[PDB]
Structure 1
Amino acid sequence: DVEFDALLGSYCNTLSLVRFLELGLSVACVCTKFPELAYMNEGRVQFEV
């Protein structure tokens, strides 16, 4: 006699990577990469209407 045991397959998947610029939210914001925030305590914007 013989009785064996088998792996009939292996299945992985793939993470999706989402950019945030391919979205519709990135219109809601003006993004900019500011290298040292850790150095600036207070930032301000001004409005004259």
Structure 2
Amino acid sequence: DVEFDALLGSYCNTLSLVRFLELGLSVACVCTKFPELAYMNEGRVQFEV
């Protein structure tokens, strides 16, 4: 007598790394980096009209 079980293949996903600038919704904002935001207390921007 000869018997055996088997494994056939092993399949995975690939998580798509998505840079935000790959989108063109980033036209709608000017996205600039603070290295520090949590220590700031005053968040006012001057507008000249």
Q: TM-score range by the shorter chain?
A: 0.7 to 0.9
- Give deviations 1:9-36, integer Å, cap 9, x for gaps: 1111211010000101111111111111
Measured on the aligned residues, the alpha-carbon RMSD in Å equals 0.9
Gaps of 5+ in 2: none
**C-alpha distance in 1, partners of 2:28/2:44?**
19
TM-score of the pair, normalised by structure 2:
0.86
After the TM superposition, list the runs of 4 or more consecutive aligned residues in structure 1 that deviate by more than 3 angstroms: none
Identical amino acids, percent of aligned pairs: 100
